[PDB]
């Protein structure tokens, strides 16, 4: 399922991303001197599930979750540098239903234990500056979809 | 290459759209109560390479071309009832250098001979009560890409 | 649907290849010193609607058809000049109505007007001494599938 | 990377299958009645890092690690249940660093916690009565590729 994610704004999953799920976002630019951008995944009831703080500023991104109310757990980071490929930056996310496994167009994936048993349904976009274009392409689907050779 | 083209707007290709050149379009919504929608491939010098009109009340598909202040040529048509797959509908243009293959979602290609040789500089997309979103999802490839098993 | 073309044989296709059918043929190898290969898109009634010479020796690849118990007609033939990328070199044959298309890994896009009004049934693979592995991958389709964005 | 892996018989890897190594095999068959078939991931010096038994009598799928001249480690098994898709049935691995995914066609994705921390090397696959094709056909990434939007 293709969705049209705008800054600042959200889209609501046609079903709930769980276990086996994998959202691909896509940017059509790459704003060098853009600032933090966030994705979150929420649960129905908001919950933060998993929190993607990118921080070219303190060359870092920050993962974390917390309840609507609540407060943000440990933070799990990795450098910000390398991970990204203009024109056109990506970020992959798959729930392997103990964890979350976040990819970026470089390095090595990101693992992110769940602390929140939930799915998601719905997936927020916020940026005052943003490193990427408005919308961002996101397809979302239920399980792995078949690979090309490359 | 990723793009995201706004209804009643356009978008500048990085290269231009030239022989064995694919161009994915894809929309996020199927708006069953929309009206005529436009997609025109444009030369640097604004002429219409390949106009593309998706009529639904007229249900017909009409592929044309004329130069930027020239007239349009005879016309070339096919149904539109059962083209399109919601709640995704795409719309894949691949230029086979003679001649350019349109295939919709269902239903067989549709081959359109070149009238103006010229490569594409732009893509447009024009609609008062458009049929997909806004912006559309644009993948263009240089050459077609890996294919998956399915 | 993925087949397995052994050298020197053939495959039965579940399917015609016809209108909008894609064969993405793979190899695991390039062998360097190989001699002429060929591959056969061949009618249930062993019409060879395409055939494909691959000579390194004379340095052409020769595109013809001919009847079963028939001669063949006039070749089309171009440069083979390094059209493989080794060490998975690959051919895509895609039946557009009118003319086949074939690419290979480098080059251009070769058209093939068809001789013969049938649908392939089988593919044939032969070479004494053969430029790819045995067998090749073979996926066919019956239509262009969803494309990567790379 | 494409390879052709023939039963009873092995591949040895170009590159270290590693964390981000995506193994997608492949079968041109579904041999109904076929015994108990098996996959091993195997180390440059021959330790079993994983061992997949699928055994249609016993109706289970038995996951196990051992060094060369060592014995079986404790079992991991789940119930076969239809988990292959005929008549091209997949078996997809991918590398997650501390553990390894397995996914079929149907059922849910398995999780194998790494026993030896080495790389594999070579892939083999043993079988007297084949559940599949001879050879399969394996796709090796380094990374997971960019995905079609379906
Ligand atoms: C190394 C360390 O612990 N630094 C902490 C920052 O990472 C915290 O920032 C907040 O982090 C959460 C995720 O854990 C989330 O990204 C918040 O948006 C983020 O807060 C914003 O960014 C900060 C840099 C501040 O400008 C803050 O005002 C913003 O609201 C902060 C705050 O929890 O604590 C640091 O110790
Ligand atoms: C069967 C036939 O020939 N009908 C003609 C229409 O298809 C023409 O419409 C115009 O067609 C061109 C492409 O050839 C392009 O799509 C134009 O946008 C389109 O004109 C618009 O749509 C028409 C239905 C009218 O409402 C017109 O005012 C719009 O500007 C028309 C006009 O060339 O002629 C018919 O004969
Ligand atoms: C310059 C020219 O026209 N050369 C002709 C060859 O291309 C012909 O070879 C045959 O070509 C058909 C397709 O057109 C097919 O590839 C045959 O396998 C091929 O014949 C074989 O290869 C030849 C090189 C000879 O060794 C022949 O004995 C084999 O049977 C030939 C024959 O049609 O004529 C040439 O003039
Ligand atoms: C209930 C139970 O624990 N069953 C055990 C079998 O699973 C074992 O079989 C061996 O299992 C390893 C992986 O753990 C591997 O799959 C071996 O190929 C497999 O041994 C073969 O298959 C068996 C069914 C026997 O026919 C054996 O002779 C073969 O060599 C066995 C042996 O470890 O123990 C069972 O208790």
Chains 1, 2, 3, 4 share one sequence.
Do not use: C
């Not at 600042?8 to 059509?28: C, G, T, Y």
């Amino acid at each position: 399922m293709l969705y049209h994610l705008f800054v600042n704004n959200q889209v609501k999953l046609q079903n709930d991303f769980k276990p086996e799920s994998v959202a691909a976002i896509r940017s059509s630019a790459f704003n060098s001197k853009g600032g933090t951008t966030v994705f979150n995944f929420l649960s129905a009831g908001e919950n933060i599930l998993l929190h993607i703080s990118i921080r070219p500023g303190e060359n870092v991104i920050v993962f974390n979750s917390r309840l609507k109310n609540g407060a943000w757990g440990p933070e799990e980071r990795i450098p910000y540098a390398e991970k990204f490929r203009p024109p056109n930056p990506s970020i992959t996310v798959i729930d392997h239903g103990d964890r979350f496994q976040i990819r970026f167009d470089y390095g090595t994936s990101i693992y992110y234990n769940k602390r929140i048993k939930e799915n998601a349904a719905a997936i927020a976009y916020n940026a005052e500056n943003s490193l990427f274009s408005s919308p961002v392409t996101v397809d979302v689907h239920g399980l792995l979809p078949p690979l090309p050779p490359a």
